[PDB]
Amino acid sequence: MKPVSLAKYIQKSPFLTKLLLPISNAYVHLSGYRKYGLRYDDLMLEENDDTQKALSRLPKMESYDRVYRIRRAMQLSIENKILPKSEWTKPEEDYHYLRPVLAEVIAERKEREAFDALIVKK
Amino acid sequence: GTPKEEGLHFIQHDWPQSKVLSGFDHASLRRGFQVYREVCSACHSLNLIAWRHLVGVTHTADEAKQMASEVEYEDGPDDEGNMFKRPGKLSDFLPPPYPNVEAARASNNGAAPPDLSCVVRGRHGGQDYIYSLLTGYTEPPAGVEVPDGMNFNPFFPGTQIAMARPLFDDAVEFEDGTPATTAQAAKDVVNFLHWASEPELDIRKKMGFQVITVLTILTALSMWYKRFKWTPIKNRKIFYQRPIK
Amino acid sequence: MASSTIYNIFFRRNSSFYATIFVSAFFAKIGFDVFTDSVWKRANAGLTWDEVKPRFLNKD
Amino acid sequence: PLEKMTQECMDAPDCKEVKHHFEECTARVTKKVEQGDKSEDCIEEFFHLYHCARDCADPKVFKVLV
Amino acid sequence: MKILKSNPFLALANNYMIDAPEPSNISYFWNFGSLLACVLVIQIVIGILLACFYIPNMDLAFLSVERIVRDVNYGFLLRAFHANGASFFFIFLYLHIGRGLYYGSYKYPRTMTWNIGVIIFLLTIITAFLGYCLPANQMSFWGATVITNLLSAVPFIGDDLVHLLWGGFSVSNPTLNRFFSLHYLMPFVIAALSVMHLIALHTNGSSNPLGVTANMDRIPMNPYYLIKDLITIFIFLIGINYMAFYNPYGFMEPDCALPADPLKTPMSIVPEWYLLPFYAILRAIPNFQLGVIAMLLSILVLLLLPLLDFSAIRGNSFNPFGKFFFWTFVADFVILAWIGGSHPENVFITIGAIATIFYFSYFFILIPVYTILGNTLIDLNLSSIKR
Amino acid sequence: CTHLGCVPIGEAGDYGGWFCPCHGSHYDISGRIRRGPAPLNLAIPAYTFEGSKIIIG
Amino acid sequence: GGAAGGKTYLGWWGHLGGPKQKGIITYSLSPFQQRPMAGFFKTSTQNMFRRVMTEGLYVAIPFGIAYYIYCWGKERNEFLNSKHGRH
Ligand SMILES: COC1=C(OC)C(=O)C(C/C=C(/C)CC/C=C(\C)CC/C=C(\C)CC/C=C(\C)CC/C=C(\C)CC/C=C(\C)CC/C=C(/C)CC/C=C(\C)CC/C=C(\C)CCC=C(C)C)=C(C)C1=O
Ligand SMILES: CCCCCCCCCCCCCCCC(=O)OC[C@H](COP(=O)([O-])OCC[N+](C)(C)C)OC(=O)CCCCCCCCCCCCCCC
Ligand SMILES: CCCCCCCCCCCCCCCC(=O)OC[C@H](COP(=O)([O-])OCC[N+](C)(C)C)OC(=O)CCCCCCCCCCCCCCC
Ligand code: HEC
Ligand code: HEM
Ligand code: HEM
């Protein structure tokens, strides 16, 4: 249905976050999406109505940069090679830029769905 | 299962027909056919091979006709019912010793000599297993006894064969002149049975070489042509002119 | 001559292309048949019925 | 020809441990059966010894079988 | 306008072969659809000729096959090619299914395509089982007897459907006649289902290894993907030609060159190798009906994959846990096939039970847990970057 | 024969029943297997009795 | 024609249903001017070495474990049904 994650309950307890930081570092290094010069939010599926609407509300600069990044990544994937270690996606630039818009759209849809189902309890 | 009830693993040899560019040994084929006719034509049936098959492989046409003209066959109805025997033709199958399976069972205790047309291809080992079975008759070791009507043979499943030693020393007189030991004769019989299983080996292995060569050349050309056509895409260059507002 | 004449003759029009393809195929079939016949004949020496004929039947 | 070469390979130094096991069989099992016990059959050692002998002997003889 | 874009039949051909936008970076694992289509075409064409010399009767079926093999001109080629193509069909089917599973091609917009493929796989299995029973070999007769009895697990009309299918009381002439007719009929239905498969897929395009959208850099099919398939076609031709010219009965068990004796009980009764894992799964469950249910579920569980894969990304190119567990599952599948092949002895039944437990655990416990864990780890690392 | 499908001989064997010389096994007078390579007992048909005639099937 | 079809995500040439692009210059050469079999061996060898060193254990571990248990199972099953195994 939708992606799920226990990414907040662990944040509730600081000790669990402190314990799981190195494992998350190693896992993100092992994933290897940064070797293609991409960002994580690019890989999210866009085939429903929510993400299609969200992608049309981004700033123009973000859309153009995303288009260039995707095209360069696919051009590299054509020849089965990666960029040198200098041109890798640094952690500072690997921020979440699509999640808030999707959250806003989902909130709007959920509000409409809530209004849809109502009852009168006298 | 238990090693006794599954038999001994067959030995491995090298045959001329097992290579990649080799056919049969037709002299061995003819000698094996002679041994077959003079030994196991009495009980084992090969009712899937015609006299015309041996023409041009182990015998000439005149030889095949002369040899086949000595077997009496049964033909269709006469002018008033009846059934009349024939001197044999070149389009008949080799004669089966028994008229039906029940007669074979009655004659040989309770066993049933299997048909030899497709036995080599239908056994776990083929030529090696058949040769080892033929040459593997030994006296039983202490502790295991064989009842009357059975023989000890480790290569047979259960180590109890219903046969007797079929190939003794100097059982057949070879036309070529080779001595007829229990090793040479078994090898020739195995070769002939393998031929009877797959008579099309020579033509198949002759066609395969040319087919493989042509296909290899075609594949080698395709691997180059794809790289030729797919060149202006694998070597693209993409530049990003940042769109300043 | 050079290399432009070759393009002018066969590789100029599709009609003059398919005919070359078919003729080359016809010749290549014969060439490959001769090659495989020679190699198979060389492979088997003293192992076929034609070369074991005198041993058996010539003595009758 | 095959029997002689197989016997020679049986007495050859190549297969001597399996032959030792088969000898210990023959002694023990013969004593057991002549005592009057029919419960033991070490056909496995005969299998091993025969396999060793045949592997030793068959390639030698098979070359001259023409 | 070009004629290819105007005439309706030429337009149909063009929209699917000449000018079709496709992703520009699909690897060599996307070449198996054409291979499957060519194998199916070869099978149908060769079977049409093979039906010209076969007599469908229990008393006279083996001699007809032998006459085909050793009396007709180049009949051995026909028989060996049909058998080996039917064998290669399942290899390419397994490769297609593995490609679809590994790169996550089942999680929309292409899910009808996956279901149609699953149905096609079921029909292919049924057709192969019907086909291999025809030559009236020993394993053919005995395996037909063993497999056909599985219909008795139905509660009410069980033990009557078996007799209706047998057309009597045991495998006899009517059974062979019905099997021949159904084996002749089914491949055309399979071809129609494949046409529907292609039609369903065409409306949304194919995926790419990266798992991201490819609506930015597209290239037409010809000549860029009409030549990439030729290499695989020629390689498969080389393989099948070698297997049919130097070792025709190389995929075949030694207990198949004997006439079916209805009294001779074979030591081991097993089907062909491509159906071995399901037979291994069936024999694991001590109960009877539960075994049939599990065997059917082992193939019908592919439909439930879309609704139990909670992943924020599509594919396995950027998911180490999936990369590990997919190969582990493939090894488990191979081990299951090996266990099904061998005897049901002491250690083998325990190994088969363990393999079945893992196989049925993979599609229910492993996938959601590791997908959720990957999502959680990635989100946790991404949430503490600037700090 | 339940072992490899052969025709046994009756009124014989060590146990006074059916005897199979194809593989040297004996079936008891009651019809079951006692010794030999035969795994299981003999099979029983679904016959019915009608006076002096028995119908098998 | 018309017929008022449904909604898809592919379209056709000209309108492929993608985001608007800007300032992406692309150069390519002619197949008759470039040279096939140029740098193929070097790049292919480097890519194969990198792929082997990168993926590697992902395939190495499960197959190795499966082979080990296969060999152990075969050996143990052969031993148990022998003479000394049953005892
Ligand atoms: C992106 O996706 C794409 C794919 O992937 C990349 C693709 O795959 C394809 C699909 C492309 C295709 C090939 C279309 C079909 C493929 C499928 C979708 C699935 C497979 C479909 C099929 C089953 C193919 C159809 C085949 C059929 C229906 C059966 C074929 C049968 C034969 C060819 C006959 C066989 C021959 C026999 C047995 C005998 C032939 C007759 C004789 C001539 C014998 C001799 C007899 C005589 C001499 C008698 C006398 C003759 C006479 C009377 C003539 C004399 C002359 C006179 C003038 C009188 C597309 C479109 C696609 O976009
Ligand atoms: C339609 C179903 C899907 C497809 C199923 C596969 C169909 C396979 C048969 C057709 C294969 C070719 C398709 C048509 C390609 C074509 O356009 O042919 C023309 C080309 C030359 O075209 P060019 O490459 O652009 O060069 C230009 C030449 N000028 C104009 C300068 C002279 O010249 C050539 O291409 C000549 C080589 C190919 C021609 C056929 C000869 C080889 C095949 C012989 C027949 C065997 C095939 C039997 C089995 C199919
Ligand atoms: C192969 C052995 C040698 C056999 C040698 C003998 C074979 C027969 C030789 C001629 C075969 C081709 C017949 C048509 C020839 C022709 O001139 O067609 C030209 C046009 C080209 O189409 P266009 O110019 O791009 O568009 C025109 C649209 N207007 C402007 C009119 C509105 O129309 C087109 O071609 C449109 C392209 C698609 C339609 C044609 C597809 C089939 C072509 C081959 C048909 C014959 C195949 C025979 C195979 C046995
Ligand atoms: C004494 C009659 C007789 C002789 C002579 C004879 N056979 Fe047999 N053969 C039989 C019988 C009976 C069986 C069945 C044995 C059994 O089923 O245990 C048999 C079995 C076989 C088998 C089947 C082995 C198996 O595992 O199923 C082969 C092969 C065979 N014999 C080959 C030969 C060859 C070769 C010769 C000639 C050297 C030969 N036989 C001579 C009667 C004979
Ligand atoms: C029009 C299509 C087909 C026809 C007319 C056909 C017909 C036949 C016939 C007559 C046989 C008997 C072989 C013999 O007598 O030796 C056979 C065998 C067989 N067929 Fe087909 N078949 C067709 C398609 C297929 C397909 C699509 C498959 C698998 C997907 C298949 C798999 C098999 C198998 C496994 C065998 C047994 C192999 C063997 O006999 O050695 N067939 N088929
Ligand atoms: C048997 C199980 C099958 C399944 C589960 C299946 C499923 C799929 C899926 C999901 C895709 C799209 C993959 C992607 O876009 O990434 C696909 C593609 C395709 N399928 Fe199948 N399919 C099956 C069998 C077949 C058969 C039998 C044929 C043809 C006879 C076929 C022909 C094709 C073709 C031509 C494509 C597009 C090109 C390609 O992917 O190679 N498929 N299939």
Ligand code: FES
């Ligand atoms: S039928 Fe097998 S031993 Fe009696």
